[PDB]
Structure formats: C-alpha cells, structure tokens
RNA sequence: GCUGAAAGCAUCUAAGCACGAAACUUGCCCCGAGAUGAGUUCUCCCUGACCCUUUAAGGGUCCUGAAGGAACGUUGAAGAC
RNA sequence: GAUGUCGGCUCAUCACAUCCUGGGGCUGAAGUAGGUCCCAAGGGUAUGGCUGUUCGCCAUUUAAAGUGGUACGCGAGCUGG
RNA sequence: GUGAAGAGGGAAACAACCCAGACCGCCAGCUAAGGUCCCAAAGUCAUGGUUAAGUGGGAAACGAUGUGGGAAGGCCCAGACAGCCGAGUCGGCCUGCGCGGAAGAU
C-alpha cells in the first residue's frame, strides 16, 4: 500500500472512498493502484 | 485444593537403584484440626481454619481457651486459613492427615527465609566493586553515583541502596514429590525450601 | 455577600436578582442592598411584598 | 429512496408480526426476527408491505432503503433458502462432513475441523467440492468467508479453497 | 447594626434523595455542588457550612453526549518513575461506578478544609436500594 | 472481511455483525484498614455505697483492682539500639 | 565580594525518527534468501591489539552489538593519562 | 505613548499591552476595559441561522462524491443517466463552516 499526502485515480478503475474518517483508493485491476492518504 | 503446614526437619538424600541421587527435604506433617468454617452468608467468603501441634495449658490465655473449646479440640500452637473451591466442604472438628497428597505430582512451598540484618550493595543487589589499587581513595565497596544533576535534583522513588536484607516471606514453586509415607508423618520433596531447621512450613498442590 | 443573600431570597419567590432589580428602579423604590439583605434574613413577609410589587413593575 | 418506494409482497402462507419495531417473520422455511432503527415506519396493507421515514430524523430515507432490502431478503430465506458452493484445488487436498463438523486436510501438519453453527447445513458431493445451505444470508456468507480464510488461493497456479464463481488470476515468475 | 452571621452549633439541614438515570454529568454535578455548599438559602456565609444531606441512585447510567462514552480518559500518577496510568469513562463504569459522579462533583467545590468537610455529605450507590430510612429523607427532582 | 442504502449498479460503514500483536486490563509473586471513606468475623472480662453545686457528656469521699499488659531474670539459626 | 572543565570508572532515568525478538500491505515475491513502507517501546542489546583519547582501523564472537535528551547526566561518589 | 519616577481593575501567574491618574474616613449609589453553568459577583436571557471535528482550545504548498447559500449552461414522456421500465440527470463558476498533511525527551 502506498501511504501518501497525495491520493489520485491513475486508472479508469479506481474508486475513492471514505473510511473511519481516512480517505482511501481502491482499485479492481492493480494491486499497485491501492491507495491511503496519512 | 486446601493444603496442610508443617515443620522442616531437616536434609538428606535418596539413592535410586539405577545409580542417582536424589537431594531430598524431610517434612513432618502431623493432623491438621479444623476450628471454623466461613461461610458467604455470615462472613463473605469461603474458608476454612485448622489448628496443628501442641501447647502447654499454663501459656494459653483465656480468649484462645474459649475460641477452642467452642469447637471441641485441644490446643495448637496456631491458626491458619485455606480458601475453598467450588465443591469442596468440610465440618467442624474434623481431621486431615497427609495422605491428602498421595496421588500429586508438584507442591509448592511457602516460608521465613533466614536474617542477614544490615548489608550492603555488593551483598543485597549485586552491585560491582571499584578498583582496589591505581590511587583509589576510601572507595572500594561504595556504590558511587546516586542521581544526575540539577534536572531533575532528586532522587527517584525505589532506589536500590543498603538496609535490612532476608527475614520475610519467599514462595518456591513446582517441587517433585518424592515420597508420601503416613505411619510416620514424612513428606520428603526435591530440592530446597526457605527457612532454617524447626520452622513453619505451608505446603500447596502446583498452580502452575 | 449582600448581593449573594439577595438573589438567594428571590428565587425561593419565583425571580432572579436582575429581573428583581429592574423591577424596583421602574417602580422607583430606593432600598438599598444592605437593608435589602437584613430583610431577606431577618423578616419574609415583608420581602415578599418586595417582590410582588417589583414583579407588577414588570408586567 | 428509489429502492424503498417499491413494496414488498408477501407470497401466501408467510406470517408477519410487527410489535413497536420488532419484526417477525414466519414460514414453511423457518423463523427470522429482527429490530428496525428507530427512525422508519412499517405498515402491512394487504399483501405488502411499505417502509418510510419518521419526523423529526435527518437520515431516514437511507434507513428506510436498509431495511427494505433486509425485509426482502428474510422474505425470500422463510420460503426458497440460500446455497453456497465451495471448491477446493491441490494435490493431498480434501474435505469430509460428520454431524455439523467439516474436516479438512489443506497440506498442514495438523488436523483442522471447523463446526458448524445453529441453521446451516454442509455437504459434500465429491471429495473436493462442499454445498451449504440456509436460511440466513449474513450467517451463510461469514461462513463461507471463515472457510476460505484458512488457506487462500495463490497467484502462482491457483491451489487453495475458492468460491464456485470466482475468477482467480495468475502471473508468471 | 451589623450584619448576619451564621454559627455552626445552630444549622438546619435535611435529607434528599436524587435518581441518575439518563442525566447529563456535568448538569448534575452543578446542582449537586451547589446545594451541598448551601447557596440556596438566605443564611448563606462563606466560612460556614450550611447545606443538606443528598443521596444519589442510579450512578451506572448516566448520560454523556457526543463520543465521550469511548474518548473521555481519566489521567493519574502513582508517584513512582513511569508511573503515568489512563483509564475511560467505558472502563470506569465497569468497574468502580460511583467514582465518575464522585470525581464530577469534587471539582466543583472550594478547595481546603472546609470543602473537604462539605464533600462529606454526598451518599452515591450505584444501584437502587439505600439503608438510610432512619433519616426519612425527600424526593428531589433536578 | 459478512450483510447493506444515501447513489435502481458498486461499496468493510453511515444502521447492524466477525477476526486481529511481546504494547493495555487481568491471571503469577511480595507489601497493604492513618483506606481519618480509620472495614468484617470468633472468643474473653467488669452487675458497690454517698456528699456538693453555678444542673451537666459536672466535681469530689469511702469500698473495690477483672480480662490483659508492662517491668525484672535465663536466652535465640531474631538484631547497630 | 568564584556556577571546578576532556576522556575513564561506579550508578542510572526518559523519548521514538525501531538495531533483535512480535503483527501486516506491495514486489521486476516459484522455494531458501532479499527490497520498500505501515503498527509496535514488554524485555534484551560484545571481549581484545594501537593511541590520553570520544571517534577510527584491525583480529575473533553474537538473535542483535539502535540513534538521541538528562549543566555535551554523574569530582561535598573515585581517578588524574 | 507608557516605565524609569505611578499605586488601582482586566489579560490564569506576567515593569513597557487595554481601562484609568490614589489629600483622609463611610458595613451608601452609577459606570469603563472585561464578563454573567460550578471553583468565583452577575442571563442555564429572547429571536433567526451554521458546525459533529471536543473544531472551539497551535501550523504550509498540496489532496478529497464532508456539509449549507447564489447566478447561469447540456440532455429529458418526439421516453434521458446507471443496470439487466417511468422522473430526472451531467459538468463547470462564486461563496460560509469543517477533514488529512501533523514525530521528543521527570
């Protein structure tokens, strides 16, 4: 997972969601795309 | 379970007929008596106090003559207290003998360690000793340093200096029972226990 | 502690100590704290006709 | 919203109850009860049953879409049920029933078994397949989730307990 | 003339008795310090104590708002090095009850020996069963 | 991770439910009611006459001296005292 | 009209930006071994040759030989190169 | 301008900041700066709105379907957007309050 201050879609299937109050990317193509903003 | 207390009588050793020996400690555990039994409804606990050896009649005062004869025995040379399981029950007057112990495996063994009076930090922590010659000065078995400076300019709460060392209570635990033997009183275990020769002894089934 | 021992008095009789006080300036009474306080501990009957007319003051 | 402004019929011989906002259903299937979030208003007409939201809450149409969708779903397990299927890839690897305990040899030094809990029941055609039904979805899916977790697929050739459906990738070295 | 004041050998007091179930701590706890002090009477003076007795039911349900019941922490030291110890309110509750509504009222009262004597008068139990009817005290709705 | 809407799909979360570490609370050992919030249980001992005054948790005269403790002596694998 | 200072010895205590032991995500992760990031402060974390040396180089060990604050901790505690 | 050579009230404690210049006595009244749930004197005041973070009660470039208000655009029963019939949907601009970035030694 990619701990970040910077969380962005790099593909076309990406999803953002809100998680106990932490902004995340999920993606359903790329484990590498897997996104978490601390 | 319940225990029982006894006396320590002193050391020996075993020999196995294969070629071991085996260093043993001789117990005599005579009858314990039962003089009270707590209850939950009265008291707030369960419980239950014995008695065991002898007493002269001419030392025994007259509260301890009547707490005895409510129950019915004769007089000891103390009172102690076992806490009981879910399950277990005993009445008033009642005997327990040694042979409580003939299918355990382990005890453990509580007592009074022997008294050392004042000591110091080589003695009591293991502190390590300075230099005995290179210009030393009246400092050989001190222990030195004791804080830092002006933060925090005290010294701390449990710091390990000098004082009274042994003469109080020690526990050891998972000893071998190595016989239990009931015409004569004799528990022999495996090792060591705190005390000197003729002292109080609680032995317990392992917790562990 | 007069101004204390007032507001204590008035609101056993159903008003706080500035409601209280407005009342008696629009009513034009000139009582002060101190007499005000002997009152309040020292004669009830009298306070609550005090505030009777204080509280008619502010209707 | 759009999901709890469709009623949901009850087919013939389904008993509902309905005290304050506990819930119960009852059929040929079996029993399920639940309680509502104190923010919906249920009522039974004829033959339906329709959801929406109390006064005086500011989340009550999502609430009234929950439990929309779970009275559906109790509605369906009461009469049809729920199935799940499981499969198991590998070389040693196998799985047998007795009572309500599973046991499975996954490759490990040591026995595994895994029971079962109250409503659901396993069995196994083959060797290497296990069917559960239920009448529970939430229990059958944790179930079904608890029984994967002790050996999970790999993405080198595959071997591990998966689901009937699911497609798994794989990479080279 | 001078002005009024109180003396301990001549003080009315009486006896209350208050339930917890669903209050909010700390606008129970206001009342609570104010009536022990005594500052609902005319007889009010500070270097005298002149409240009333209050018993206090019910102290396992109370009621805390917002995310208090898993994010309130009660801090003390043991005065050994490192001795630094936290607890929650959740915790609190589960094991000594009656401490929360204690510790809630003792720091709203005057600090030194008079508010240590005022303290005195506060009965807290947490369930719903006191053996004070000697003392026929009064229902108090706060 | 399961079930699930706001957002007819999807979603571990907003309503509900399950796992998860030598860190946290216990389980093991030792101290501990001056815990002035000074706690509980079992046993033992004391059952006489009068005066005064400013009248009360008052002062005094004769008879009586329990349970127990302390002091002294011979001492201890207890101890600077 | 005075707050003794470099290294060494004896004795310590705290933080976490974690050296070992514990729990996880990604891998250009087949296995054994690795790389990078997240959580985690309970315990444990070398003896010698040279030099006044802290450092440093060297020889042989260890699961590991952590980085910093405390008057660059500590001379009414020692030494005096 | 103040302190030095200036006391009193407020800012928790705080020469130089805000209010304000002490001849002596009073158990009288009105106000300034600042305040009115308890420590501690005085509104648990009245009406209309926002925040869910204990934000209020420490801090950036940058990132995000958090949540209020305003002015316009594209498609829409000549059946639109998502999925396999029936009421709306899509993307930007201006503005109020919150979330992340956020590690230290008794």
């Not at chain 2, 225990?3 to 320590?8: A, E, S």
């Not at chain 2, 294969?18 to 400690?25: F, H, K, L, M």
Request: aromatic share 6%; net charge positive.
């Amino acid at each position: 997972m990619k701990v970040r201050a910077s969380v962005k879609k790099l593909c076309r299937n990406c999803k953002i969601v809100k998680r106990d109050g932490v902004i995340r990317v999920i993606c359903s193509a790329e484990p590498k795309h897997k996104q978490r903003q601390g | 379970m319940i225990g029982l207390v006894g006396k320590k009588v002193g050391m020996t050793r075993i020999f196995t007929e294969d070629g071991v020996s085996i260093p043993v400690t001789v117990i005599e555990v005579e009858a314990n008596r039962v003089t009270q039994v707590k209850d939950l409804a009265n008291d707030g606990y369960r419980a239950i106090q014995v008695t065991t050896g002898a007493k002269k009649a001419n030392r025994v005062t007259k509260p301890e003559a009547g707490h005895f004869a409510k129950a019915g025995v004769e007089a000891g040379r103390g009172l102690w207290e076992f806490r009981l399981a879910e399950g277990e029950e005993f009445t008033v007057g009642q005997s327990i003998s040694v042979e409580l112990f003939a299918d355990v495996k382990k005890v453990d063994v509580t007592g009074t360690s022997k008294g050392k009076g004042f000591a110091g930090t080589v003695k009591r922590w293991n502190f390590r000793t300075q230099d005995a010659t290179h210009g030393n000065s009246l400092s050989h078995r001190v222990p030195g340093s004791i804080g830092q400076n002006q933060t925090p300019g005290k010294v701390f709460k449990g710091k390990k200096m000098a004082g009274q060392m042994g003469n109080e209570r020690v526990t050891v635990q998972s000893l071998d029972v190595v016989r239990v033997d009931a015409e004569r009183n004799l528990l022999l275990v495996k090792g060591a226990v705190p005390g000197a020769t003729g002292s109080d002894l609680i032995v317990k089934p392992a917790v562990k | 502690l007069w101004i204390a021992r007032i507001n204590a008095a008035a609101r056993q009789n159903g008003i706080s100590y500035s409601k209280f006080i407005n009342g008696l300036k629009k009513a034009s009474v000139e009582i002060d704290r101190k007499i005000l306080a002997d009152i309040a501990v020292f004669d009830k009957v009298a306070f609550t006709a005090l505030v009777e007319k204080a509280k008619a003051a502010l209707a | 919203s759009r999901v709890a402004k469709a009623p949901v019929v009850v087919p013939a011989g389904v008993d509902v109850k309905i005290n304050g906002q506990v819930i119960t259903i009852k059929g040929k299937n079996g029993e399920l009860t639940r309680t509502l979030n104190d923010a919906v208003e249920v009522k039974h007409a004829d033959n339906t049953l329709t959801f929406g939201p109390r006064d005086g809450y500011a989340d009550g149409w999502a609430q009234a879409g929950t439990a929309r969708a779970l009275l559906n779903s109790m509605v369906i397990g009461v009469t049809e049920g729920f199935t799940k299927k499981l499969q198991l890839v590998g070389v040693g690897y196998r799985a047998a029933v007795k009572g309500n305990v599973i046991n499975l040899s996954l490759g490990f030094s040591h026995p595994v078994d895994h029971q079962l809990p109250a409503g659901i029941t396993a069995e196994c055609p083959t060797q290497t397949e296990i069917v559960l039904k239920g009448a529970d979805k939430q229990v059958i899916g944790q179930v079904a989730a608890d029984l994967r977790a002790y050996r999970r697929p790999e993405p080198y050739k595959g071997k591990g307990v998966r689901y009937a459906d699911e497609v798994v990738r794989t990479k080279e070295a | 003339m001078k002005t009024f004041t109180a003396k301990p050998e001549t003080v009315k007091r009486d006896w209350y008795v208050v339930d917890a179930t669903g209050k909010t701590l700390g606008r129970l706890a206001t009342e609570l310090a104010r009536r022990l002090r005594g500052k609902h009477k005319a007889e009010y003076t500070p270097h005298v104590d002149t409240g009333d007795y209050i018993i206090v039911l019910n102290a396992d349900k109370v009621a805390v708002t917002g995310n208090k019941r898993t994010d309130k922490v009660y801090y003390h030291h043991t005065g050994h090095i490192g001795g630094i110890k936290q607890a929650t309110f959740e915790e609190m509750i589960a094991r000594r009850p009656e401490r929360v509504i204690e510790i809630a009222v003792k720091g709203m009262l005057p600090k030194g020996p008079l508010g240590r004597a005022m303290f005195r008068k506060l009965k807290v139990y947490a369930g719903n069963e006191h053996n004070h009817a000697a003392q026929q005290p009064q229902v108090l709705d706060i």
